[PDB]
Design a protein around this ligand. Sequence first.
Ligand SMILES: NC(=O)c1ccc[n+]([C@@H]2O[C@H](COP(=O)([O-])OP(=O)(O)OC[C@H]3O[C@@H](n4cnc5c(N)ncnc54)[C@H](O)[C@@H]3O)[C@@H](O)[C@H]2O)c1
Ligand SMILES: NC(=O)c1ccc[n+]([C@@H]2O[C@H](COP(=O)([O-])OP(=O)(O)OC[C@H]3O[C@@H](n4cnc5c(N)ncnc54)[C@H](O)[C@@H]3O)[C@@H](O)[C@H]2O)c1
Ligand SMILES: NC(=O)c1ccc[n+]([C@@H]2O[C@H](COP(=O)([O-])OP(=O)(O)OC[C@H]3O[C@@H](n4cnc5c(N)ncnc54)[C@H](O)[C@@H]3O)[C@@H](O)[C@H]2O)c1
Ligand SMILES: NC(=O)c1ccc[n+]([C@@H]2O[C@H](COP(=O)([O-])OP(=O)(O)OC[C@H]3O[C@@H](n4cnc5c(N)ncnc54)[C@H](O)[C@@H]3O)[C@@H](O)[C@H]2O)c1
Ligand SMILES: CC(=O)N[C@H]1[C@@H](OP(=O)(O)OP(=O)(O)OC[C@H]2O[C@@H](n3ccc(=O)[nH]c3=O)[C@H](O)[C@@H]2O)O[C@H](C(=O)O)[C@@H](O)[C@@H]1O
Ligand SMILES: CC(=O)N[C@H]1[C@@H](OP(=O)(O)OP(=O)(O)OC[C@H]2O[C@@H](n3ccc(=O)[nH]c3=O)[C@H](O)[C@@H]2O)O[C@H](C(=O)O)[C@@H](O)[C@@H]1O
Ligand SMILES: CC(=O)N[C@H]1[C@@H](OP(=O)(O)OP(=O)(O)OC[C@H]2O[C@@H](n3ccc(=O)[nH]c3=O)[C@H](O)[C@@H]2O)O[C@H](C(=O)O)[C@@H](O)[C@@H]1O
Ligand SMILES: CC(=O)N[C@H]1[C@@H](OP(=O)(O)OP(=O)(O)OC[C@H]2O[C@@H](n3ccc(=O)[nH]c3=O)[C@H](O)[C@@H]2O)O[C@H](C(=O)O)[C@@H](O)[C@@H]1O
Ligand SMILES: [Cl-]
Ligand SMILES: [Cl-]
Ligand SMILES: [Cl-]
Ligand SMILES: [Cl-]
Lengths: 310, 310, 310, 307
Amino acid sequence: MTRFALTGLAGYIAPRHLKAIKEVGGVLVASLDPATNVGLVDSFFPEAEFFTEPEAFEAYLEDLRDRGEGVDYLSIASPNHLHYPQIRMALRLGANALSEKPLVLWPEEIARLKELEARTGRRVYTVLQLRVHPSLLALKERLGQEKGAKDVVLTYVTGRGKWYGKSWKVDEAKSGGLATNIGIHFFDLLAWLFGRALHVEVHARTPTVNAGYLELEGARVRWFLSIDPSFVPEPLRRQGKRTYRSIAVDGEEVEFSEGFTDLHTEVYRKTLAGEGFGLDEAAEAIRVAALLRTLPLSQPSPENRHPFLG
Amino acid sequence: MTRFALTGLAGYIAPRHLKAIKEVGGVLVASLDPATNVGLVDSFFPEAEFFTEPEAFEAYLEDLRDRGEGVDYLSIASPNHLHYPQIRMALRLGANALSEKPLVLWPEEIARLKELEARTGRRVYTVLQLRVHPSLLALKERLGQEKGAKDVVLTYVTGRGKWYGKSWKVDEAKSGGLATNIGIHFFDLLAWLFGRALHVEVHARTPTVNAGYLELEGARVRWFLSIDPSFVPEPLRRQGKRTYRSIAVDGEEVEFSEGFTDLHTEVYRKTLAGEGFGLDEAAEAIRVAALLRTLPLSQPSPENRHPFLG
Amino acid sequence: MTRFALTGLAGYIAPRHLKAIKEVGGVLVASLDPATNVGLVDSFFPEAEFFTEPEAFEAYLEDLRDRGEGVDYLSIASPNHLHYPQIRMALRLGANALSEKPLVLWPEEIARLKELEARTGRRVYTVLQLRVHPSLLALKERLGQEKGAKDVVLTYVTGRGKWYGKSWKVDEAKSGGLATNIGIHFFDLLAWLFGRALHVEVHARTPTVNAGYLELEGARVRWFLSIDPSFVPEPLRRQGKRTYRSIAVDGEEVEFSEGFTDLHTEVYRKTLAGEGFGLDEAAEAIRVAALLRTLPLSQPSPENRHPFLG
Amino acid sequence: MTRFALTGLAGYIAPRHLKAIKEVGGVLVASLDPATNVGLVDSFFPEAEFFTEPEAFEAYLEDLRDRGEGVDYLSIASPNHLHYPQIRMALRLGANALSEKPLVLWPEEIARLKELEARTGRRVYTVLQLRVHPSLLALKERLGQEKGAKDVVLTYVTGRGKWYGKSWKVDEAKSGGLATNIGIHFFDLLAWLFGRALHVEVHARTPTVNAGYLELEGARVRWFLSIDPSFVPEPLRRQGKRTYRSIAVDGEEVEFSEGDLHTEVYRKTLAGEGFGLDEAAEAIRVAALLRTLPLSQPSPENRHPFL
Ligand SMILES: NC(=O)c1ccc[n+]([C@@H]2O[C@H](COP(=O)([O-])OP(=O)(O)OC[C@H]3O[C@@H](n4cnc5c(N)ncnc54)[C@H](O)[C@@H]3O)[C@@H](O)[C@H]2O)c1
Ligand SMILES: NC(=O)c1ccc[n+]([C@@H]2O[C@H](COP(=O)([O-])OP(=O)(O)OC[C@H]3O[C@@H](n4cnc5c(N)ncnc54)[C@H](O)[C@@H]3O)[C@@H](O)[C@H]2O)c1
Ligand SMILES: NC(=O)c1ccc[n+]([C@@H]2O[C@H](COP(=O)([O-])OP(=O)(O)OC[C@H]3O[C@@H](n4cnc5c(N)ncnc54)[C@H](O)[C@@H]3O)[C@@H](O)[C@H]2O)c1
Ligand SMILES: NC(=O)c1ccc[n+]([C@@H]2O[C@H](COP(=O)([O-])OP(=O)(O)OC[C@H]3O[C@@H](n4cnc5c(N)ncnc54)[C@H](O)[C@@H]3O)[C@@H](O)[C@H]2O)c1
Ligand SMILES: CC(=O)N[C@H]1[C@@H](OP(=O)(O)OP(=O)(O)OC[C@H]2O[C@@H](n3ccc(=O)[nH]c3=O)[C@H](O)[C@@H]2O)O[C@H](C(=O)O)[C@@H](O)[C@@H]1O
Ligand SMILES: CC(=O)N[C@H]1[C@@H](OP(=O)(O)OP(=O)(O)OC[C@H]2O[C@@H](n3ccc(=O)[nH]c3=O)[C@H](O)[C@@H]2O)O[C@H](C(=O)O)[C@@H](O)[C@@H]1O
Ligand SMILES: CC(=O)N[C@H]1[C@@H](OP(=O)(O)OP(=O)(O)OC[C@H]2O[C@@H](n3ccc(=O)[nH]c3=O)[C@H](O)[C@@H]2O)O[C@H](C(=O)O)[C@@H](O)[C@@H]1O
Ligand SMILES: CC(=O)N[C@H]1[C@@H](OP(=O)(O)OP(=O)(O)OC[C@H]2O[C@@H](n3ccc(=O)[nH]c3=O)[C@H](O)[C@@H]2O)O[C@H](C(=O)O)[C@@H](O)[C@@H]1O
Ligand SMILES: [Cl-]
Ligand SMILES: [Cl-]
Ligand SMILES: [Cl-]
Ligand SMILES: [Cl-]
């Protein structure tokens, strides 16, 4: 049984990690979370230890290591800014890391972790589940058959109620900003499908809307991201729908369904089989997100302006 | 359309409150919780306000009240020691209070809420779902048919992993202790079936077990409470059970480990129709738990001793 | 003997409040703060009650009131975004409020407080110690003696090390931003001296620097505000000084880096003597600070530019 | 210049650590505390880094050493239950530790630290200022110029208002209980003066009082500890004194109610004369026994007067 510890046990995404650890036959040995509604853990791993203090959690896994029972993986589902130091914890404990996205917030942290992987003999992986979504895998094989850059329009609107503005997720120093926190997976999907960003522009940057343009090696991309559910197109909004994804590639919609229940598990599966997404796979989206977070706004040309920008 | 606010939204029991508010066709106007994994609320009430600061939640509700739009109920699912001051907030805001058990921790607090109900024109109600469990309402019907006090064996085992001992639930000043935080349900069930407690003894009192004997108007009761999954009887531990709740009366036995899904809803239904559990109904279990809190351990006569003790 | 309760006991400013209350012959009945290094309080008011939960602090004060022993004042030293809801608490308890600056973050809040004072017959005061600084009182007396617009240069450097960036003080939602949390002192000084701001520009807004230009009824004002200690005039840096506050107006320069030891007690004295700063006195600086918060940066004309951006 | 990092910067005792570091020529390079009224630090070490997340502080310190700029000491002033894990962080970073009392909460943690010291070549020290108090260094003096068991009465009343009951200091899992959190100083003083405890009893253990009786190699000791100020003897009381610390040894009283001892401790620690695991271990063993022994009824001759 591969042996896991987990951070962020009380959070929204952690149950998918409990399910994944179970479904690959792993065992959860310990969890860390300063918050304590975590009792769902009893249904999966009735024996797991639990800590509220990071140093106590670390001291415990270090004793496990020192007496031959260390965890193989620290799975990390804490707020975004804690990814890097908790990955650093995984490696100093002689463990591999399996971190929620964004893997870390800064290109400079990716580099530092490259070095520590070397000197530590351990590896850093990340959960990028769009990469295992069967429609998007299908999209990538097709594109492999095609010549020429694609023109892409990417839209993602994901309504959040009021609690969202009271959470770490809108605190730029913890979340990296809207584009990072609700965008990272789409910029990662774009890098995966279309390669490196030669040019990056940001055209709107407010508390509820980020929008802009990328020129990547394989695509020109106009993109729009929002947490305000009224950018949902009116035919779906009159239905009380709260979200809307759409990637169109050369005017054609890319149909990937919501229905998928298993993608965290598939990621965990790939990772254990030595096919996981490492620092090299993750880095380009992080680099773009860091630029998006820090670049001054620019005025878009008409070719370059997302349609929702008007 | 009854208007609710709710405290402790991120917690373990909150989701059953969100379902009861929906199912009774109320609307959730605002929630408070310093912890912010609360996004499940979007699935129910995508417009509700949200606060992490109680003073700000209170000023918002007060504004609504002052402009004629105040909530009807404050549903309270925060840790036990805050039930009382949040019920006080409820009344001072013009809302009835609908509070998780233990309604409050101390009988002196019960008596203060009685005065205040009078000065504020609103009511304090409590969630005592064992009182609407159909097997127990059934058990109560049979008991009413018979003359004489009954001899009762009450066994309540609810396994918890290590997380429980890092939570407020084991902090006696926040939870009132194991016999309050878990036991109040059964002390209240026994008050409802058998009336007042004439004599109370505690025989064991450790971080994981509490046990003792009560003489109530209608019954003699030996009781055993534990958070150690190991006291679940062997036949049920084999099939993976962590929770065992049984009352045996003269030797007829009812299991009620099961069937709680939407008993919260039913409590909400009764409470809205004016047949809710008020301060008069809740006081006696509260008085008993408070006594069990300060009481010195005593040696049990063998007729007074629960069978899981020896 | 004036009865006080206090919020924010564990913080940087609270010790001036303890001293103020003691020195005007007040007594501290109770305090509130989630944080608990507050033991200094025993050496002022060894019997005061202490709460970490706002709802409990409030129920307690309300009991005191209900039995004819309410506090006379709630002194408020919590983070800036909590001022409004805590003054609302004080008034709903039949106490006056004496709040730290900024009295509140939003002008519209000043208008609700005004209505609550009439209903209540209680008053909301604020701590504006610059208005009692002898150097600034004397400046104001001299300026009284001459008609015509004044030409003003205001420099306010309050050097802060790295800890400041992890504090609520740099979280815009809680502090209002540098120009509010520190700036309000000098925007209020300026309003007090020269009246209403007719025109407002912001030239720099970074994490350590805010600067801009005002035109008020009585004066034009070039201002610069920084928490970077490198901005202290070299001559004074040489000497270990980390804070520099001066106002230069028409051929005279008044320094006010020091002289603050007793100013909080003098504010309490004036307020207890019915000469405190109320909503009317505080509102203009609050209005300007709220404007500065949202205004887009603009290119300064050279004559409108503070010399430190020079 | 000796390089320190500090934990617990926002708390009650931290300013004595800032003063000590400054006064022995040290430099504070970084601090950790989840709480943020820490601005006092700018008037000592205006350049120090500051962290609220332990993992982030530790990554930073590790970076410092992965490139030759490590701290030499980690000064630890966080709640008691965090001493052990923070000392571990110190040793794992290649730094020595200088931890507030009690050094750790359990005897078994002492043994594990002793192993880590050997693996690492680094050392764990602790702040036991009563050992540097000139009035107790002088009691110890007079003492070792006679043998034979002493008869000792220890009274330690350290008055605290209502805020104390809302603090980690009364949470037994964090503080170890009253006899540990306050008691450890006098249990250590006694072990230092009189050696190992051979017999231990507890006669009262309430939220405000712990009292009992010890027999040590060199003394019998009746002891009483309270955070309730009303146990200050009615003479010193009617005048609003709120702390009283007395050890009477065969009828003669030394009083240590009123205090720079932290600096002396840092000095001796950096001078190679600090208080290590060996020194700290006995008080820790006794405090652990008392947090856990069942109460017992004292014989009259073994019962502290104040009972
Ligand atoms: N793949 C997806 O579909 C998906 C969806 C949501 C979130 N996420 C990602 O998962 C991570 C968690 O997001 P969440 O949505 O579950 O947010 P969350 O706020 O619901 O959960 C956060 C949890 O982390 C805890 N935490 C805070 N500090 C910690 C520490 N020092 N150590 C351990 N735990 C700590 C908090 O108490 C909280 O319980 C984020 O990185 C986010 O980007 C991914
Ligand atoms: N009938 C049942 O089956 C049942 C089961 C579990 C719990 N409960 C009761 O429900 C209440 C909650 O229990 P829980 O299990 O969900 O514990 P929990 O720890 O999971 O949930 C606690 C929630 O309260 C929040 N909280 C803390 N302070 C608050 C404040 N000042 N205002 C608002 N919220 C605050 C915490 O952040 C947390 O999110 C308790 O009274 C418990 O006795 C009943
Ligand atoms: N006039 C001045 O020179 C001056 C100086 C500093 C602060 N102030 C003002 O005083 C207030 C406090 O500033 P601070 O310097 O002392 O910063 P601080 O961060 O040092 O102290 C803040 C205290 O508020 C507490 N707190 C948080 N939430 C609370 C709540 N709901 N109720 C009660 N307390 C709560 C925190 O735990 C902390 O102990 C701010 O408004 C600030 O603008 C004025
Ligand atoms: N020798 C003495 O006279 C004396 C006096 C007080 C305390 N102490 C010891 O010092 C330590 C601190 O006591 P205190 O009086 O100053 O209590 P305190 O509660 O005033 O200070 C505690 C500080 O620790 C911080 N903290 C909490 N978790 C932390 C973490 N993971 N990392 C860093 N800091 C964290 C808190 O935020 C707080 O600022 C305790 O061991 C106490 O026994 C010694
Ligand atoms: C009826 C009753 O006694 N209610 C009390 C009872 O709650 P309930 O009935 O739901 O316990 P049960 O185990 O049957 O839950 C089913 C699942 O949820 C999981 N569970 C349960 C509790 C929890 O906090 N977290 C959690 O994940 C658990 O792992 C199970 O798998 O114990 C709580 C507690 O001591 O904490 C008390 O606060 C309640 O007042
Ligand atoms: C794939 C992807 O976009 N991942 C990101 C995505 O989450 P996901 O896709 O699951 O949300 P989706 O809208 O599809 O609905 C799921 C349901 O749960 C609700 N939801 C959503 C987030 C949350 O914290 N809580 C929550 O209840 C929501 O109301 C729905 O009802 O948004 C997160 C966020 O917005 O913070 C990011 O942190 C993630 O990186
Ligand atoms: C030597 C010794 O016993 N040390 C222990 C002792 O501290 P010390 O000697 O400093 O307190 P003394 O009673 O002499 O009061 C001094 C003044 O400060 C105030 N004081 C005191 C403690 C506090 O936490 N806060 C505070 O303001 C108090 O109000 C007085 O005004 O109590 C601590 C505690 O209670 O936790 C333990 O952590 C220490 O290890
Ligand atoms: C009058 C005025 O400008 N008030 C504002 C001003 O505070 P004040 O005048 O006291 O600071 P000054 O620069 O003189 O430092 C004095 C010493 O204290 C130390 N100091 C200072 C602030 C602090 O938070 N902590 C601290 O330890 C500092 O290291 C110095 O050693 O900054 C506060 C803030 O920065 O948030 C605002 O909340 C105030 O409203
Ligand atoms: Cl822990
Ligand atoms: Cl809020
Ligand atoms: Cl409280
Ligand atoms: Cl940090």
